[PDB]
Amino acid sequence: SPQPLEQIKLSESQLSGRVGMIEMDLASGRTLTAWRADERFPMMSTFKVVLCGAVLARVDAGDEQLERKIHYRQQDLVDYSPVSEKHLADGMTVGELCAAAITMSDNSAANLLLATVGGPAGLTAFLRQIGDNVTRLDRWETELNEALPGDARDTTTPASMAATLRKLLTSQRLSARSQRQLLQWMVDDRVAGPLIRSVLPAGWFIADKTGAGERGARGIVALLGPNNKAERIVVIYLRDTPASMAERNQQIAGIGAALIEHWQR
Ligand SMILES: OC[C@H]1O[C@H](O[C@H]2[C@H](O)[C@@H](O)[C@H](OCCCCCCC3CCCCC3)O[C@@H]2CO)[C@H](O)[C@@H](O)[C@@H]1O
Ligand SMILES: *C(=O)N1C[C@H](NOS(=O)(=O)O)CC[C@H]1C(N)=O
């Protein structure tokens, strides 16, 4: 491969769309590679990690329990709800809802959880409380994926998302058990985790959440590292490209290949 920044540029040229990326040391927060890291991109389903951060903060404060069963109705459901469509009868716990949202990208689960944290405005307020003044949620599933050109709604920046993920996973804003739970939900992603592992060299750790939206919007938030350790946060967003889902996936994989090849930096 070319160096990471060279590959990122190449990806952007080949996609005819915009790429945004941060590679950040998880322990120290140092930024190692950055490309358009202060530009706005739709979060899409990647927002569900921050959502469940806000849920966990409520559990730590005694204002929520992961065991609390939420009974919901069919009229509540939106598109892509593979897990929540199974539990109309008996409901799902708050914790099961987070697992469904993060590990199966269940959109209705995400909306149920958004209710519990005060909606998009409430999640945004949580973001401001942990010192993220950039990321914003404005809408519910599935309208938050619309990705209208130049629309700041439901966006983050690579730099802000990476910093926020580090805060949630490592800063002790969340309790020890909560940090461990949030990490484990990302380890357990069924949507892209196993696919990523199938192309990773032996010895490389992955935990992740992916997303997709309109106008080619695609993204991943991840923890990655050699020696079976989560060494770095990697955030990649794509927007405004007419490329196929397959070519967007391949281009993200190519950036990952370059990071691996030139890891020592
Ligand atoms: O010398 C480093 C390694 O080089 C190759 O590994 C290849 C691998 O065979 C290929 O499948 C992958 O594709 C990239 C797969 C990327 C998947 C992770 C992508 C995510 C993770 C973080 C968020 C953004 C993207 O590249 C690496 C590096 O060249 C060799 O196969 C391997 O034996 C060797 O250990
Ligand atoms: C999140 O971006 N959404 C939920 C679902 N799966 O996302 S993923 O496969 O990219 O992880 C479908 C895409 C999407 C959506 N449009 O709501």
Residue numbers in the entry: 26 to 238, 240 to 252, 254 to 292
Give the authors' words:
In addition, we have also determined the structure of avibactam bound to SHV-1. This latter enzyme is also found in K. pneumoniae, which is often responsible for hospital-acquired infections with SHV variants demonstrating an ESBL phenotype. The structure of avibactam complexed to SHV-1 shows that this DBO inhibitor is covalently bound in a similar fashion in the active site compared to KPC-2 although there as some differences. An important difference is the sulfate moiety of avibactam makes an arginine-mediated salt bridge interaction in SHV-1 involving R244, while in KPC-2 this is absent. An additional contributing difference is that T237 in KPC-2 is more bulky than the corresponding A237 in SHV-1 and likely forces a shift in the avibactam sulfate moiety. In addition to the difference in the sulfate binding region, another variation is that Y105 in SHV-1 is disordered and occupies two conformations whereas its corresponding residue in KPC-2, W105, occupies a single conformation. In contrast, in SHV-1 and KPC-2, the avibactam N6 atom is not pointing towards its C7 atom as the distance between these atoms is greater than 3.8 Å in both structures. Also, the N6 atom of avibactam is situated further from the hydroxyl atom of S130 (i.e. 3.3 Å in SHV-1 and 3.7 Å when bound to KPC-2). In the SHV-1:avibactam complex, residue S130 is not making a strong hydrogen with avibactam, this amino acid is located at a distance of greater than 3.3 Å from the sulfate moiety. In addition to KPC-2, a similar study regarding avibactam resistance substitutions was carried out with SHV-1 β-lactamase. This latter study showed that the S130G and K234R both conferred increased resistance to avibactam/ampicillin in SHV-1.
Bacterial β-lactamase enzymes are a major contributor to antibiotic resistance by hydrolyzing β-lactam antibiotics. Avibactam, which is used in combination with the β-lactam antibiotic ceftazidime, possesses a relatively broad-spectrum inhibition activity as it can inhibit class A, C, and some class D β-lactamases including extended-spectrum β-lactamases such as SHV variants. Furthermore, avibactam inhibits serine β-lactamases via a reversible mechanism which differentiates it from the currently available inhibitors. We found avibactam covalently bonded to S70 in the active site of KPC-2 and SHV-1.
